[PDB]
C-alpha cells in the first residue's frame, strides 16, 4: 500500500531534482521503487499513518543523502574493493563491493546476503545493483529490513535520528554534524510534502 502514500508524482518531485548529467537520472524510477517496496512486507505499511509516512520519508532521507539526491549510482572515487577476506562470503577476484544503489550497499558480506534474498549473485555480480532498476531499490528496502535496525527503530520510537544510527552510528553524537544535518533536511523537506509532523527524536 506505499504506493498510496508515495505517489508517482511525489517520486519524481524527488527524482526531479537531480542533474540531466547524474547517472541516476531515468535509472532511480518509481515503477523500480513500488516493486522493491511491496517485496518486504511491513516496510511503509506499518503502523498508523503517521507511522508509515514518518518511516517512508526517513527512508527517503536516508536515500536523497546517500545518493546525493538520487543523482549517483555509483559510489564516487571508491579507495578500495571494499573486500573483506570471508570463507562464509568470498570477494571474487577483480570485482568491487563499492557503494551502489540508493542506500550505497557496500562490501562483500553485504553484497553476498542481499543477493541471497533478492536472487542475484552478489558475489560474482556486484554491478547488477548498478544496472538492474528494481534490483538496486531492492537492495535498499532489504538493508533498511533485514540488514540493519532501521525498520525497528523508526517503528519504535527512536524516531529519524534511530534511523541514522541503525545506517552510519560514527556521525551522531558530533561524529559528523554536517552529514546528520544533511539527513535531517531532507526528512523535514520530505515530511513537509507529506503533511506529516517529522515527530521526536529527528537528530542524534
Given at each position: 500500500?506505499?504506493?498510496?502514500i508515495i505517489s508517482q508524482s511525489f517520486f519524481n518531485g524527488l527524482a526531479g531534482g537531480a542533474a540531466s548529467s547524474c547517472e541516476g537520472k531515468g535509472f532511480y524510477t518509481y515503477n523500480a521503487f513500488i516493486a522493491?517496496?511491496?517485496?518486504?512486507?511491513?516496510?511503509?505499511?506499518?503502523?498508523?499513518?503517521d507511522v508509515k509516512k514518518r518511516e517512508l520519508a526517513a527512508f527517503f532521507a536516508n536515500v536523497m543523502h546517500e545518493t546525493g539526491g538520487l543523482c549517483y549510482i555509483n559510489e564516487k572515487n571508491?579507495?578500495?574493493?571494499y573486500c573483506?577476506?570471508?570463507?562464509?562470503?568470498?570477494?571474487?577476484?577483480?570485482?568491487?563491493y563499492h557503494g551502489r544503489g540508493p542506500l550505497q550497499l557496500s562490501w562483500n558480506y553485504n553484497y553476498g546476503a542481499a543477493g541471497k534474498s533478492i536472487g542475484?549473485?552478489?558475489?560474482?555480480?556486484?554491478?547488477?545493483?548498478?544496472?538492474?532498476?528494481?534490483?538496486?531499490?531492492?537492495?535498499?528496502?532489504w538493508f533498511w529490513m533485514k540488514n540493519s535496525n532501521c525498520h525497528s527503530a523508526?517503528?519504535?520510537?527512536?524516531?529519524?535520528?534511530g534511523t541514522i544510527k541503525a545506517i552510519n552510528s560514527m556521525e551522531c553524537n558530533g561524529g559528523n554534524s554536517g552529514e546528520v544535518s544533511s539527513r535531517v533536511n531532507?526528512?523535514?523537506?520530505?515530511?513537509?510534502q507529506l503533511g506529516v509532523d517529522p515527530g521526536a527524536n529527528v537528530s542524534c
Open positions: 500500500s506505499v504506493g498510496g522493491a517496496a511491496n517485496a518486504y512486507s511491513g516496510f511503509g505499511t506499518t503502523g498508523s499513518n571508491p579507495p578500495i574493493n573483506q577476506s570471508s570463507s562464509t562470503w568470498p570477494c571474487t577476484s577483480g570485482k568491487s542475484f549473485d552478489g558475489l560474482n555480480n556486484p554491478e547488477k545493483v548498478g544496472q538492474d532498476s528494481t534490483i538496486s531499490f531492492k537492495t535498499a528496502v523508526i517503528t519504535s520510537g527512536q524516531g529519524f535520528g531532507y526528512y523535514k523537506k520530505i515530511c513537509s
